[PDB]
Amino acid sequence: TQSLVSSMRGTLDKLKLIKSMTPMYLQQLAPVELAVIAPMLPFPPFQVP
Amino acid sequence: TQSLVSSMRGTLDKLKLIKSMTPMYLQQLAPVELAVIAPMLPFPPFQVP
Amino acid sequence: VALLSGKYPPDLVTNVWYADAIYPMYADTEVFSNLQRDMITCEAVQTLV
Amino acid sequence: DEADEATKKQAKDTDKSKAQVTYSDTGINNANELSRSGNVDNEGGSNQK
Amino acid sequence: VLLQRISPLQIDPTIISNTMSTVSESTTQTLSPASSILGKLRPSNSDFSSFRVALAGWLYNGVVTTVIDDSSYPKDGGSVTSLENLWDFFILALALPL
Amino acid sequence: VLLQRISPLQIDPTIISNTMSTVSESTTQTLSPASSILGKLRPSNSDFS
Amino acid sequence: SFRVALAGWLYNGVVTTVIDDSSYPKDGGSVTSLENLWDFFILALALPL
Amino acid sequence: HGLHGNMTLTSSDIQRHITEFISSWQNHPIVQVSADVENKKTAQ
Amino acid sequence: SMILTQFGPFIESISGITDQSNDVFEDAAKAFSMFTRSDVYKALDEIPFSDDAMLPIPPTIYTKPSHDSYYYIDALNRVRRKTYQGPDDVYVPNCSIVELLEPHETLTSYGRLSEAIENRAKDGDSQARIATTYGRIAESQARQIKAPLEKFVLALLVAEAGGSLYDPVLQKYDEIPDLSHNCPLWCFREICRHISGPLPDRAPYLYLSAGVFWLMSPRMTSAIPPLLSDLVNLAILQQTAGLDPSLVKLGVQICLHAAASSSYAWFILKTKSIFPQNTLHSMYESLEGGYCPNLEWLEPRSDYKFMYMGVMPLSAKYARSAPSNDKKARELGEKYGLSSVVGELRKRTKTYVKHDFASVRYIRDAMACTSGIFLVRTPTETVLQEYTQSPEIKVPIPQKDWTGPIGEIRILKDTTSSIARYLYRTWYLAAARMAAQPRTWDPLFQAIMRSQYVTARGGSGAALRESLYAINVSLPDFKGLPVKAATKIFQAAQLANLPFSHTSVAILADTSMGLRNQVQRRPRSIMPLNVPQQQVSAPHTLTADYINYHMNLSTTSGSAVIEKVIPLGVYASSPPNQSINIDISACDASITWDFFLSVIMAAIHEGVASSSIGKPFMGVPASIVNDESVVGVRAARPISGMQNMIQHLSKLYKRGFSYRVNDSFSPGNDFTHMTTTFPSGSTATSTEHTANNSTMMETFLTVWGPEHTDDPDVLRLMKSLTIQRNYVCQGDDGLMIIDGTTAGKVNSETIQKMLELISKYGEEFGWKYDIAYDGTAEYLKLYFIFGCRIPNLSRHPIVGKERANSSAEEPWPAILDQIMGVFFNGVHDGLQWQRWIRYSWALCCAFSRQRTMIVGYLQYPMWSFVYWGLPLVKAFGSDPWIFSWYMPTGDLGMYSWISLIRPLMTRWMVANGYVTDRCSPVFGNADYRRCFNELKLYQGYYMAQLPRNPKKSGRAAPREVREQFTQALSDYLMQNPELKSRVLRGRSEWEKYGAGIIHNPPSLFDVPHKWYQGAQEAAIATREELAEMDETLMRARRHSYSSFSKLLEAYLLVKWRMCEAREPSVDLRLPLCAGIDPLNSDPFLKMVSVGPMLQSTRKYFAQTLFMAKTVSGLDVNAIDSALLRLRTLGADKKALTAQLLMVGLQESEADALAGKIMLQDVNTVQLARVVNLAVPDTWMSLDFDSMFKHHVKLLPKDGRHLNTDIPPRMGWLRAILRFLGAGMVMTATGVAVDIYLEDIHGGGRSLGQRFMTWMRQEGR
């Protein structure tokens, strides 16, 4: 039905335009925290590319 | 929804066409009252352009 | 949910916040202890062989 | 220990809980400071006996 | 106080409610623009005191600068998908030029 | 635990509910996308870790 | 403190007078804080003595 | 199974619901691997 | 033997072997009424107790000295106690009374006080006076019970005779030890037998209606009644909650030591903290594992948002770090001779190394063992010991810091070295912000404030009468009014139209007394204040509310446990967070004119200016007074309404208070006392207490601490702390919350140093801070450790009742309300559910019958208790134990259980022979009307909705005096022409548009009638009123019935479908509430299925009402229910506007609100008030919001059904359907399940039509 289509479009628009700071936190701040923490761990990091 | 769009347009039209006398009062009468009140104020007006 | 519902403190100053947060962490010496542990481990391996 | 005595005496002379002027816990790092004590003798040995 | 004493302009009690009680709507919708705008407006007679002090502030811009209080703005900046935020924008837009 | 208790980011799920509370839809429909997504965005056992 | 600084002007060789570290802005401070600005003002006028 | 209009509450239904709840709790990912105590290796 | 022979079927019925039935309930009531206490004791003799229950008894119990060397006459001719143990031994001593007992006719063994004693007492003999004081105080001490202990012990025996119970969830028999190991009962029997001796009567005393009759035995002692009360409470708790008999024995030993001591109450008061000190404040010193919750405090911190992360594993790094209390416990135990008890407690406590269910249950069991009684002492000693202290201001404000007087108050300079500057600034700014508010000047707001203090309680109007007679003004007598004159309503009627100049002198009147005893606490004194004093206190009150509402983390709550904030406590207790408990000792005494009253009164008086110039308030006019603060010139300054009111209050605050004391227990100890203690009966006390608490804490955190300490760690800690983020205060209690640094917890000795810093800061202005840093959190009488909360059973005595005067008891129906309250308290603390339900059924059956000579016997059927909230055990041949106690009360619960067992009921009735030939949609072919009629289900159901106290209404009064009373009340209420105009406009609009839609709309003019009804109903009743009440119950019982209420009939047309279980909300290994452990099956499953509520109830319920507050006598729920019913029935917007005008609103926002309401959408809780539907109080600790929103589906699972269709207009039916489904799912036992709507018989439209018919019908 047309009403359901309009409701879905509005919900998707709201989900797209939601105001969350997690994506910018993960891009600008989380690496710094990980780098600061890393030297102090009992088990040093072990990575592959 | 179409009904919400119609209701919003009607509401905006009514707000545009409301019968308020304040904008005309502010243009034609308030300056006269301010002018007749000003000369007998304990603190004379102090203005910049 | 975490990705969609991130939020910062209303007035955040990152340098001050981190200078307050990390300071207690860097008073520990477990890493200095672990270095001495590793030295003994290597000594033991070589002695065994 | 001698530094703590000076601050404690200084507070008493001003008749206050603590003194504004303090000889201890300054911002300076006097970790290498030494003061005379009865632990060592003239030859440079210990006074355990 | 002096302006209130000598002025002929006075508040109309029910003009907004009367004009908004005739907008055509459907009762099966979850949003009502008329109800929302009335709830955001909340008319009162004491509201004219702020209007009159705003008028009085015109004579002393040298020492006093009249501003809109920060609490009137949306808490997080708002969104255009929100009818409530649209009404906040409308109210602020009408109030600012005075 | 260290990341959670050093980071300034906070998880506040009420943002999603506040955003979805203003979606436009009819009450005579059978499916409500807003209610469905709100119900499905509640993590099992409330782990958030 | 004022009179003590005046007196300590005469004994530069054996006593060094410095401003206590607790008088500095907390966590380094920021130019976005009125309290930090006043801290900087007080410290700037107090240092040359 | 429990769809007709004649609903009568009983201990068998209670037990069935309890079993479903327990299975749902136990099949959670974090519940699968967790412990209150620590073994020698993880302590090391 | 005797119990088995008398109660044969009833025991099986309540144990779940056979069905429950009204006839069995009835003959059980017969037996309960036909036993006697001699039969009770001989039944007690039958039990073959074991050696485990054996315990040595001190011989010193039975031989005490006389009361003679315990009392003396002071200089002022007053009886006073002789303090030997210390400066607080002012309670009832333990001594014999058999010499002063006199034989009673027809009761040879029992006698009362000799009447010659009070003859010589009124004559004036000192010996007679002290003797009668001792006798009356002993009577008052022995009277502090709900009912005779024989009823309780007999009910316990009947309940326990059933034996072990099978658990439908655990599929096993419980293994609670039987009565052969119950130590307190054995001690009870032994002590009663020894007191009785060869004398045939065995009860130590008769609990008469308004007195006590002691046995003339040479071994009698005053401590026997409280000792037996403690013993019976311990026995009931042990047999209902599975207490450890070992710990029970320790508690009994403490009780025996208290009895053997000189003063029972004094001994308990000195040693009340044993169990908390040796169990709670010393725990997990060797922690090794477990789970603790992980929460997060979300901004706004003020708004109290706590959202739950998960579980966090524990480790050794989170062991106990607070300082030890071993030493202090040792000298306490040694001093009071409980060293072995203390040592055993510590040894048993040390054996826990893992936080879990066993440890929390052990802590709860240790907590429950503390004795609980309402302490009693004479009002003379209470007054002379509580109102004689004063603050000790070590550092006072220098005298050269106050200007010349203004009015009569002074201005504090800005150069003062005292810390009072910050308090002054805070109060000044708060007052200015309050004054600059349009709502402050709303005349309706003023009317609300003025009607607030008016109450149907006493206000010491006598002294008002002598004062006004002295100033010679005359008040109406209101002769012929059948209402009491000792009410503030009567006071307001007397002073309706009186000039403020005439009434001004009344503020310096005198004050009467009030007392309330408390459990494990000294009695609390209340100081009533009459109209003028209550009215002159408004500005200070409102400023304090502004402070507590905009500048701190203030909390408000009542006696209800549900109203507290569990999330805050669990967050504070959960590691690595830590908590500090702060309590101000004698806050009322500390608050005085020397520092506080001076500073705050000056600040408020100067802050209130500007926004109030030359304009009255509260009906107090503005005025003109003298000013001389400015040097060299002293002129006249005009003051406002609040300024004049503060000016008049200031002289009272500077002089002090006069207190009349009229001690009934002591003839001749009648006098007047001058005190400086701040009043407790005022309408702000707690509010400014919280304000000053927060202000002074902030002052210490920001100024005093950093300039008195130099330790860098302490400085950093105090800089981190802030009151707006880490301090919660209310009245005199407060909580400091310290978060965890990245390295774990915070340094313990650094914290400790901050503690003595706080104390030192306290002594300067003379506040006695009591600081607890022990590893647990205590706030508002709630306890938390490691995130789990410990319910304190000792604080809620089962057989405890508050009686602090010589007034008599109430008629019989009143006791059932107290019994139901006891059952609900047991529910909240969370005892073993099966045993608790069995005991509750036994007790209700015991108290369900009474006799009236009209020689008739009035009886309550078993169905009345089911309606009131008691769940069933087994009925109609259904499976036993299939109903939980979360069942709603009334129609909702009835519908819930009936719909749960509906199909089986039809089969049972048909098999029993109640067949008909009409296809009823609910019961098919069953003669349900007839069946219910003989089963008394209809009769009990209908007698449930009847008052349990006589109605004092219908009193004869002449029309003239009634009309003068009403017009006086109306004149007092309507002090405002704009209010009168608004109400008249509302009435005109109502009679224009809304007429006949609802029969009775709330209105402001109806307040005088409500006040008159309350005043007349607060009076005592008499024999004829009891007569009409009894005959109404008899008529209700004899009359026949054909159906339930229309609401219930409409409810029973809805069918659901319970298909799938819910999803877990909390981990099944996290102990969060002690006593709800896996052993207590059903509540554990309910809690882990639904989830605890993580939000304050008050703030959540705040946004469920259109209007927030209203004048006293009108109900906000009534108002919004009327508005919603008008909207539902379809009245126009003008009707709602008329209603809002009639309730006092201004026309503009009234019409705006009506327009908003006409199309605005409210939540399910707000909708449900149209049909008088409310959330059960038992659900307040659970998250019912999620169940309402996402777990009750109003759509059939398979798809769309033709019947299950809600008409668009009737959108309000969804809330009702949600509540019905939630009630069903909560009434059903086990885990919560997802419920789907199945069918409606007549469709949505018919149900809506029936509901509208109902709504239109009420009001008649």
PDB file of N, CA and C in Angstrom, chain E residues 11-60:
ATOM      1  N   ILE E  11      -4.023  41.701  24.118  1.00  0.00           N
ATOM      2  CA  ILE E  11      -3.967  40.322  23.651  1.00  0.00           C
ATOM      3  C   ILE E  11      -5.361  39.845  23.268  1.00  0.00           C
ATOM      4  N   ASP E  12      -5.439  39.066  22.195  1.00  0.00           N
ATOM      5  CA  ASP E  12      -6.675  38.361  21.882  1.00  0.00           C
ATOM      6  C   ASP E  12      -6.607  36.954  22.460  1.00  0.00           C
ATOM      7  N   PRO E  13      -7.610  36.526  23.230  1.00  0.00           N
ATOM      8  CA  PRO E  13      -7.471  35.245  23.939  1.00  0.00           C
ATOM      9  C   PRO E  13      -7.474  34.029  23.029  1.00  0.00           C
ATOM     10  N   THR E  14      -8.398  33.953  22.067  1.00  0.00           N
ATOM     11  CA  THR E  14      -8.660  32.696  21.376  1.00  0.00           C
ATOM     12  C   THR E  14      -8.465  32.785  19.866  1.00  0.00           C
ATOM     13  N   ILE E  15      -7.719  33.773  19.371  1.00  0.00           N
ATOM     14  CA  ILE E  15      -7.601  33.943  17.923  1.00  0.00           C
ATOM     15  C   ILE E  15      -6.885  32.750  17.293  1.00  0.00           C
ATOM     16  N   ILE E  16      -5.784  32.309  17.903  1.00  0.00           N
ATOM     17  CA  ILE E  16      -4.995  31.227  17.321  1.00  0.00           C
ATOM     18  C   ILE E  16      -5.765  29.914  17.380  1.00  0.00           C
ATOM     19  N   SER E  17      -6.376  29.620  18.528  1.00  0.00           N
ATOM     20  CA  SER E  17      -7.145  28.388  18.650  1.00  0.00           C
ATOM     21  C   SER E  17      -8.328  28.381  17.691  1.00  0.00           C
ATOM     22  N   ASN E  18      -9.021  29.515  17.566  1.00  0.00           N
ATOM     23  CA  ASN E  18     -10.155  29.586  16.654  1.00  0.00           C
ATOM     24  C   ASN E  18      -9.718  29.384  15.211  1.00  0.00           C
ATOM     25  N   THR E  19      -8.601  29.996  14.809  1.00  0.00           N
ATOM     26  CA  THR E  19      -8.182  29.864  13.419  1.00  0.00           C
ATOM     27  C   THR E  19      -7.626  28.475  13.135  1.00  0.00           C
ATOM     28  N   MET E  20      -7.076  27.804  14.146  1.00  0.00           N
ATOM     29  CA  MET E  20      -6.511  26.476  13.951  1.00  0.00           C
ATOM     30  C   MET E  20      -7.518  25.355  14.177  1.00  0.00           C
ATOM     31  N   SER E  21      -8.701  25.663  14.697  1.00  0.00           N
ATOM     32  CA  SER E  21      -9.727  24.652  14.906  1.00  0.00           C
ATOM     33  C   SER E  21     -10.513  24.326  13.643  1.00  0.00           C
ATOM     34  N   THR E  22     -10.084  24.819  12.479  1.00  0.00           N
ATOM     35  CA  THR E  22     -10.810  24.587  11.238  1.00  0.00           C
ATOM     36  C   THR E  22      -9.936  24.006  10.134  1.00  0.00           C
ATOM     37  N   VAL E  23      -8.741  23.516  10.458  1.00  0.00           N
ATOM     38  CA  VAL E  23      -7.898  22.886   9.450  1.00  0.00           C
ATOM     39  C   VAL E  23      -8.350  21.446   9.244  1.00  0.00           C
ATOM     40  N   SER E  24      -8.461  21.036   7.983  1.00  0.00           N
ATOM     41  CA  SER E  24      -8.943  19.700   7.660  1.00  0.00           C
ATOM     42  C   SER E  24      -7.845  18.672   7.893  1.00  0.00           C
ATOM     43  N   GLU E  25      -8.175  17.618   8.635  1.00  0.00           N
ATOM     44  CA  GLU E  25      -7.217  16.576   8.975  1.00  0.00           C
ATOM     45  C   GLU E  25      -7.929  15.233   9.002  1.00  0.00           C
ATOM     46  N   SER E  26      -7.136  14.169   8.963  1.00  0.00           N
ATOM     47  CA  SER E  26      -7.632  12.812   9.123  1.00  0.00           C
ATOM     48  C   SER E  26      -7.272  12.292  10.509  1.00  0.00           C
ATOM     49  N   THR E  27      -8.194  11.541  11.102  1.00  0.00           N
ATOM     50  CA  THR E  27      -8.031  11.053  12.464  1.00  0.00           C
ATOM     51  C   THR E  27      -7.224   9.766  12.547  1.00  0.00           C
ATOM     52  N   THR E  28      -6.773   9.226  11.417  1.00  0.00           N
ATOM     53  CA  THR E  28      -5.983   8.004  11.397  1.00  0.00           C
ATOM     54  C   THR E  28      -4.491   8.273  11.257  1.00  0.00           C
ATOM     55  N   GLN E  29      -4.067   9.525  11.382  1.00  0.00           N
ATOM     56  CA  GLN E  29      -2.664   9.891  11.280  1.00  0.00           C
ATOM     57  C   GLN E  29      -2.044   9.994  12.667  1.00  0.00           C
ATOM     58  N   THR E  30      -0.740   9.733  12.738  1.00  0.00           N
ATOM     59  CA  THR E  30      -0.031   9.809  14.009  1.00  0.00           C
ATOM     60  C   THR E  30       0.532  11.195  14.294  1.00  0.00           C
ATOM     61  N   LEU E  31       0.426  12.127  13.352  1.00  0.00           N
ATOM     62  CA  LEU E  31       0.955  13.472  13.524  1.00  0.00           C
ATOM     63  C   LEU E  31      -0.123  14.494  13.202  1.00  0.00           C
ATOM     64  N   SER E  32      -0.215  15.531  14.033  1.00  0.00           N
ATOM     65  CA  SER E  32      -1.199  16.595  13.854  1.00  0.00           C
ATOM     66  C   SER E  32      -0.485  17.937  13.906  1.00  0.00           C
ATOM     67  N   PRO E  33      -0.341  18.636  12.775  1.00  0.00           N
ATOM     68  CA  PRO E  33       0.331  19.945  12.807  1.00  0.00           C
ATOM     69  C   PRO E  33      -0.345  20.955  13.717  1.00  0.00           C
ATOM     70  N   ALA E  34      -1.678  20.974  13.756  1.00  0.00           N
ATOM     71  CA  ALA E  34      -2.379  21.943  14.593  1.00  0.00           C
ATOM     72  C   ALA E  34      -2.113  21.687  16.071  1.00  0.00           C
ATOM     73  N   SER E  35      -2.235  20.430  16.497  1.00  0.00           N
ATOM     74  CA  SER E  35      -1.948  20.094  17.886  1.00  0.00           C
ATOM     75  C   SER E  35      -0.503  20.412  18.235  1.00  0.00           C
ATOM     76  N   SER E  36       0.427  20.074  17.339  1.00  0.00           N
ATOM     77  CA  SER E  36       1.838  20.329  17.606  1.00  0.00           C
ATOM     78  C   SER E  36       2.113  21.821  17.756  1.00  0.00           C
ATOM     79  N   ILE E  37       1.563  22.640  16.857  1.00  0.00           N
ATOM     80  CA  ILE E  37       1.850  24.071  16.902  1.00  0.00           C
ATOM     81  C   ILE E  37       1.210  24.706  18.131  1.00  0.00           C
ATOM     82  N   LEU E  38       0.006  24.258  18.501  1.00  0.00           N
ATOM     83  CA  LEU E  38      -0.613  24.787  19.713  1.00  0.00           C
ATOM     84  C   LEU E  38       0.205  24.428  20.946  1.00  0.00           C
ATOM     85  N   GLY E  39       0.683  23.183  21.015  1.00  0.00           N
ATOM     86  CA  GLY E  39       1.501  22.775  22.143  1.00  0.00           C
ATOM     87  C   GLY E  39       2.817  23.524  22.217  1.00  0.00           C
ATOM     88  N   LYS E  40       3.394  23.855  21.062  1.00  0.00           N
ATOM     89  CA  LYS E  40       4.639  24.619  21.073  1.00  0.00           C
ATOM     90  C   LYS E  40       4.390  26.083  21.412  1.00  0.00           C
ATOM     91  N   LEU E  41       3.207  26.601  21.077  1.00  0.00           N
ATOM     92  CA  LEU E  41       2.937  28.014  21.314  1.00  0.00           C
ATOM     93  C   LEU E  41       2.571  28.281  22.768  1.00  0.00           C
ATOM     94  N   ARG E  42       1.508  27.639  23.269  1.00  0.00           N
ATOM     95  CA  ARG E  42       1.053  27.864  24.642  1.00  0.00           C
ATOM     96  C   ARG E  42       0.867  29.349  24.938  1.00  0.00           C
ATOM     97  N   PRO E  43      -0.135  30.006  24.358  1.00  0.00           N
ATOM     98  CA  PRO E  43      -0.295  31.447  24.584  1.00  0.00           C
ATOM     99  C   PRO E  43      -0.627  31.765  26.033  1.00  0.00           C
ATOM    100  N   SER E  44      -0.167  32.931  26.483  1.00  0.00           N
ATOM    101  CA  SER E  44      -0.454  33.417  27.824  1.00  0.00           C
ATOM    102  C   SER E  44      -0.486  34.937  27.802  1.00  0.00           C
ATOM    103  N   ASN E  45      -1.213  35.516  28.759  1.00  0.00           N
ATOM    104  CA  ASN E  45      -1.346  36.968  28.806  1.00  0.00           C
ATOM    105  C   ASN E  45      -0.039  37.625  29.234  1.00  0.00           C
ATOM    106  N   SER E  46       0.716  36.972  30.119  1.00  0.00           N
ATOM    107  CA  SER E  46       1.965  37.547  30.605  1.00  0.00           C
ATOM    108  C   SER E  46       3.027  37.627  29.518  1.00  0.00           C
ATOM    109  N   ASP E  47       2.796  36.993  28.367  1.00  0.00           N
ATOM    110  CA  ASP E  47       3.777  37.029  27.287  1.00  0.00           C
ATOM    111  C   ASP E  47       3.998  38.441  26.764  1.00  0.00           C
ATOM    112  N   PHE E  48       3.034  39.338  26.969  1.00  0.00           N
ATOM    113  CA  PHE E  48       3.165  40.703  26.475  1.00  0.00           C
ATOM    114  C   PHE E  48       4.205  41.516  27.235  1.00  0.00           C
ATOM    115  N   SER E  49       4.560  41.115  28.456  1.00  0.00           N
ATOM    116  CA  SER E  49       5.593  41.827  29.199  1.00  0.00           C
ATOM    117  C   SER E  49       6.945  41.726  28.503  1.00  0.00           C
ATOM    118  N   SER E  50       7.283  40.538  27.995  1.00  0.00           N
ATOM    119  CA  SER E  50       8.524  40.379  27.245  1.00  0.00           C
ATOM    120  C   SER E  50       8.508  41.223  25.979  1.00  0.00           C
ATOM    121  N   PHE E  51       7.365  41.266  25.297  1.00  0.00           N
ATOM    122  CA  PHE E  51       7.235  42.102  24.111  1.00  0.00           C
ATOM    123  C   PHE E  51       7.469  43.570  24.447  1.00  0.00           C
ATOM    124  N   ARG E  52       6.908  44.035  25.564  1.00  0.00           N
ATOM    125  CA  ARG E  52       7.049  45.443  25.915  1.00  0.00           C
ATOM    126  C   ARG E  52       8.465  45.774  26.372  1.00  0.00           C
ATOM    127  N   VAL E  53       9.135  44.856  27.073  1.00  0.00           N
ATOM    128  CA  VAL E  53      10.523  45.141  27.432  1.00  0.00           C
ATOM    129  C   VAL E  53      11.413  45.098  26.194  1.00  0.00           C
ATOM    130  N   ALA E  54      11.080  44.257  25.213  1.00  0.00           N
ATOM    131  CA  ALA E  54      11.809  44.278  23.950  1.00  0.00           C
ATOM    132  C   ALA E  54      11.635  45.618  23.249  1.00  0.00           C
ATOM    133  N   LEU E  55      10.415  46.159  23.271  1.00  0.00           N
ATOM    134  CA  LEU E  55      10.197  47.496  22.725  1.00  0.00           C
ATOM    135  C   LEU E  55      11.001  48.543  23.486  1.00  0.00           C
ATOM    136  N   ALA E  56      11.029  48.441  24.814  1.00  0.00           N
ATOM    137  CA  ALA E  56      11.740  49.426  25.623  1.00  0.00           C
ATOM    138  C   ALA E  56      13.241  49.374  25.372  1.00  0.00           C
ATOM    139  N   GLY E  57      13.765  48.194  25.046  1.00  0.00           N
ATOM    140  CA  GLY E  57      15.196  48.054  24.832  1.00  0.00           C
ATOM    141  C   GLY E  57      15.727  48.816  23.635  1.00  0.00           C
ATOM    142  N   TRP E  58      14.841  49.334  22.783  1.00  0.00           N
ATOM    143  CA  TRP E  58      15.278  50.057  21.594  1.00  0.00           C
ATOM    144  C   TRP E  58      15.961  51.375  21.926  1.00  0.00           C
ATOM    145  N   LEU E  59      15.696  51.943  23.098  1.00  0.00           N
ATOM    146  CA  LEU E  59      16.210  53.257  23.455  1.00  0.00           C
ATOM    147  C   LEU E  59      17.576  53.211  24.123  1.00  0.00           C
ATOM    148  N   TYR E  60      18.120  52.027  24.389  1.00  0.00           N
ATOM    149  CA  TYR E  60      19.364  51.917  25.140  1.00  0.00           C
ATOM    150  C   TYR E  60      20.287  50.879  24.521  1.00  0.00           C
TER     151      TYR E  60
END
